[PDB]
Amino acid sequence: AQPFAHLTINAASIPSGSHKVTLSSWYHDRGWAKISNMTLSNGKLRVNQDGFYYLYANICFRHHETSGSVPTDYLQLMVYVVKTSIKIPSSHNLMKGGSTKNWSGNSEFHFYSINVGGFFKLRAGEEISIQVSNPSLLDPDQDATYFGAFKVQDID
Amino acid sequence: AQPFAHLTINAASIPSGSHKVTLSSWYHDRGWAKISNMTLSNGKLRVNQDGFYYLYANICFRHHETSGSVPTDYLQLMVYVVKTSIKIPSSHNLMKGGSTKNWSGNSEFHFYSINVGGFFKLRAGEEISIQVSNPSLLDPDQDATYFGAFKVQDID
Amino acid sequence: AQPFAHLTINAASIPSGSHKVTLSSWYHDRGWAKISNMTLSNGKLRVNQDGFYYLYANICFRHHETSGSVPTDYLQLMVYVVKTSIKIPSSHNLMKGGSTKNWSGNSEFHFYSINVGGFFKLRAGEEISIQVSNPSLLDPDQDATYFGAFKVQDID
Numbered sequence: 001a002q003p004f005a006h007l008t009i010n011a012a013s014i015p016s017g018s019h020k021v022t023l024s025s026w027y028h029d030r031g032w033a034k035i036s037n038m039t040l041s042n043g044k045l046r047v048n049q050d051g052f053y054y055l056y057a058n059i060c061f062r063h064h065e066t067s068g069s070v071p072t073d074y075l076q077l078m079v080y081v082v083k084t085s086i087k088i089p090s091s092h093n094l095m096k097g098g099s100t101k102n103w104s105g106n107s108e109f110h111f112y113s114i115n116v117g118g119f120f121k122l123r124a125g126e127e128i129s130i131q132v133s134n135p136s137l138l139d140p141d142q143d144a145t146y147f148g149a150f151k152v153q154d155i156d
Numbered sequence: 157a158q159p160f161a162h163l164t165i166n167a168a169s170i171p172s173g174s175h176k177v178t179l180s181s182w183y184h185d186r187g188w189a190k191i192s193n194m195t196l197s198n199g200k201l202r203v204n205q206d207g208f209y210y211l212y213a214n215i216c217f218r219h220h221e222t223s224g225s226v227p228t229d230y231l232q233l234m235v236y237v238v239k240t241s242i243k244i245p246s247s248h249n250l251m252k253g254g255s256t257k258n259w260s261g262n263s264e265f266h267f268y269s270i271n272v273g274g275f276f277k278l279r280a281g282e283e284i285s286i287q288v289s290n291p292s293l294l295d296p297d298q299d300a301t302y303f304g305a306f307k308v309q310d311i312d
Numbered sequence: 313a314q315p316f317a318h319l320t321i322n323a324a325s326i327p328s329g330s331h332k333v334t335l336s337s338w339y340h341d342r343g344w345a346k347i348s349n350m351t352l353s354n355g356k357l358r359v360n361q362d363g364f365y366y367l368y369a370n371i372c373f374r375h376h377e378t379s380g381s382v383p384t385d386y387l388q389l390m391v392y393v394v395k396t397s398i399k400i401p402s403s404h405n406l407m408k409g410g411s412t413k414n415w416s417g418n419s420e421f422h423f424y425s426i427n428v429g430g431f432f433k434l435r436a437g438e439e440i441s442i443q444v445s446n447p448s449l450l451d452p453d454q455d456a457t458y459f460g461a462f463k464v465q466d467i468d
Contacts, residue, residue, distance in 0.1 A: 093455035143249035
């Protein structure tokens, strides 16, 4: 039936840096993770069926004093949903979300989630990927960090 | 026709504590609140028809110095969208969102909202409910705190 | 086919005030901005076909110390999705989101994004618009600030 995907983060895809990076490991076969009529290729969600899709992502970041220090008090926690063309490899942000945070001292725990959503016209061959800042602060739970898409209607 | 629900907060389901609780009272028949081919049973949204639904929630929290003061300098405003099943009961988190906030001195007025959304496969008999921390800080307005769902396609 | 819109901010509709305003200039014809069987009239999205629609908005605010300073150390960064009508002079709030935030001159860069979404029953002639506080702090990129709608089903 109509294409779709709901992907949960695989805790492998997370270095120990602050640099913005493409998340490359997502489950598509366990818990809430599912996919149909679309292809997952190392963090790249390829469209197989032309259409107007509703796209979305939810990203939680967290930090507990107990787990150690971090280079700085002030973080830029951002999420970018990117479209890339297998044909014309031009790459652009479909959506952006996030917040600057002062997780400064004398607080045992800090947490913050970001969500984005939107309706976009997609062509088979096009790929959707997720980039985030501070990926070492990501919350690994499946109810926490995910992204997905579902076709609403055909190209018109 | 296809099932759906948009439920608004009934200011009754609001204790005076900071412990996380399931919100049990939502309207389904005034203002923007509505429901069709779905059943609301004391805070639980039961699925009637099997399908792939888009689920969402928006939750607003606020605080006035005039109202008094916060339980602590550092607060944790969170939302959890929980799924349950007839027999074989088992609370399962579908999504979570939130932030840690320092609500003190600053301005007699503090506010923060959270939103979560996602595409899930659902079976008749399963129930969607909402839990939040600091429920006594909820914004009672129908445009501030609500949750809902709408079927997108049949199970496949 | 079924109606929809995805509108992106036109940097014209941005005053230099802190006063809450209705954003009056959106693109419907370039980049990801698109519209089908809905009509844009200076900031309001008119519904032309009765239906149950999914509505959404993403708003991003940001500040560069190089741009000068913020009107207050503690800012109210809010968005309200409002419904008005071609006929009556009413004005109804459908969703609200936002946060109070300290951008107290220290860090050289501040950013914060908000997103809201919901399922609403709409009649031809009703119009959707966006109101935000601190409009001079809006991020003008098409992936940062937008709102839209897509019909899910006919009225019932």
